[PDB]
């Protein structure tokens, strides 16, 4: 059973450059030289559920799909969306999809989009013949317990939202394969407390520093690098292609050094084939870095018929997910 | 394709009585007489991921399953688990399942278990022939920003965890059907009057529901909820291939007797003896574990034997209305 991507959409607010951040004293001058970043998309007071609604509407309106025809809604995120005891997917269920679908919030850090693609693809295959599913990501890091500039090491957090409409019937693109491996031994990399949940602020740099200070074996990082290449080898094998067939690579919007060494230099591909130039100005958009990169490559016409995109992403777990999207025809909105 | 329940497991800490709560001044005497609840399961400083790890291991060890053969892990929850920027399923991934599965956190209030059963059933059907999936729920409502006694109207929150092991191959029970309808017009019931800022304030569903009734009393939202409550039960029974007469027991949430009787049992036209209220009232509302822990208790004690059916009914944020039917084929391999 084939799973086709009918359409994709996003919402990106106004970008704040690093030169501005350096002047006010939010971002460091040395870090601006160390990480050659462009900027970060800042929403401000716009809720993340609203940003997801804008991205979902564009994806639906692009291909001319009916919101009621959807059989699944997967809202993914890595940070608080709204009030506690209330999930964000009901907002899209009210103002778009309708209450005759399976709406459910996914959470797996920045790799939540990859897991949603697996669950959505499995849901469509098991379901009826004419099926369709909506997968969306959205986050607003402009909050009290999150500093977009200094929280994450090697990247600047950004606000926005990504969307994608999967379907059983033929479309412009096709999801060939998508995997998700993990190194659970390095699960302490993204924490350092578990008795009391909320209260303290977020800072991945200190949590990574605390994890690096003490390890039982400490061959986690190397097994993480092994499992980075393993999941890519597995995804390409399932998709039925080689690394030579890959046209572009969609890694997260981390520092130029990190994107070069960990992703592109590991696979043995040039930095021109990455989505770094575009991604640098946007920053790390939670779990929307590869779908917004796919959107930009598809919409502009850089990724034409016959080409393959290699979506890769490492997140908390540490979980390493890889996906392969093939463009069959040109997009109906380009 | 048939989706069988291989086994089920749970964890329930020491139950604090309602009479104790009235003496200390946490729970009012009026609500004690009105709701007629027994008590609530209270964990001290035990994390919810640990509580899920107990329930997961129990369900796995009961049927003699090996954790690595699982092809899916669905961790569901209604409230915070641990540190932010870190999901709880990785804890079970290290100390049980392993990093060769699709681990992912589900969130849909108290009906998150029902949605996980749909996604797990669909994942097993679409996947290979021999398959198995672990679905688990776990929550700890022990403050700061959550008063277990006064937060929820008509129910006392309780700590614990519920587990269930789905599979393609034959088992002791069978998941006949499971669905989830929603009335998105009443999504502001649990939101109330505050969206821009995410955190800082405490959770209090009574004031959130109270604020919604002012907005409602200024479209027929509540009648739609009551309509779609009976609709999802009708369609789940129709999908399962049975009638309401075939239902032996019913598993509703552990809310007050007045709520459990009127909204669920009186609505379906069944007696309160057929509910799981006598057992559930002691434990309280276990986030999204009320129906599976009720499934567990009925299975191991021998009250729900071969040929019987269990009608799991839920109502959560959305407002989402989920219903499921579980048929016991043979006696459990662990009782």
Numbering used by the authors:
A (entry chain A): 4 to 196, 202 to 224, 229 to 346
B (entry chain B): 4 to 197, 202 to 225, 230 to 346
Excerpt from the paper describing this PDB structure:
In the current study, the crystal structure of ChlB3 was solved at 3.1 Å-resolution and a catalytic mechanism was proposed on the basis of conserved residues of structurally related enzymes. The protein structure was present in the space group of P212121 with four dimers per asymmetric unit. The refined model of ChlB3 contained 334 residues in each monomer and no electron density was observed for its 197–201 and 227–230 residues. ChlB3 structure is organized as a homodimer and each monomer having its own active site. Each ChlB3 monomer has a seven-layered core composed of two layers of helices interspersed by five layers of sheet, with several connecting loop regions around the core. The core region features an internal duplication of two segments (14–183 and 184–339) that are comparable in structure except at their loop regions, although there is no major sequence similarity between the two halves. A total of 2627.6 Å area is buried in the dimer interface of ChlB3 protein. The main chains of Thr205, Arg215, Gly112, Ala185, Arg239, Gln110, Gln92, Gln90, Gly102, Asp103, Trp89, Gly85 and Glu190 are involved in hydrogen bonding at the monomer-monomer interface. Generally, in KSIII enzymes cystine is responsible for the transacylation process, although histidine and aspartic acid catalytic residues crucial for Claisen-like condensation. ChlB3 catalytic triad (Cys113, His296 and Asp301) as shown in Figure 2C, significantly differs in electrostatic character and geometry, despite the catalytic cysteine (Cys113) occupying the same position as those seen in both structurally related enzymes. The volume of active site cavity, as calculated by the program CASTp 3.0, was 934 Å3.
Chlorothricin (CHL) belongs to a spirotetronate antibiotic family produced by Streptomyces antibioticus that inhibits pyruvate carboxylase and malate dehydrogenase. A previous study reported that ChlB3 is involved in the conversion of 6-methylsalicyl-S-ChlB1-ACP to 6-methylsalicyl-S-ChlB2 with catalytic efficiency kcat/Km = 1690.70 mM−1 min−1. ChlB3 is a dimer having the same active sites as CerJ (a structural homologous enzyme) and uses a KSIII-like fold to work as an acyltransferase. Structural comparison indicated that ChlB3 belongs to FabH family and showed 0.6–2.5 Å root mean square deviation (RMSD) with structural homologous enzymes.
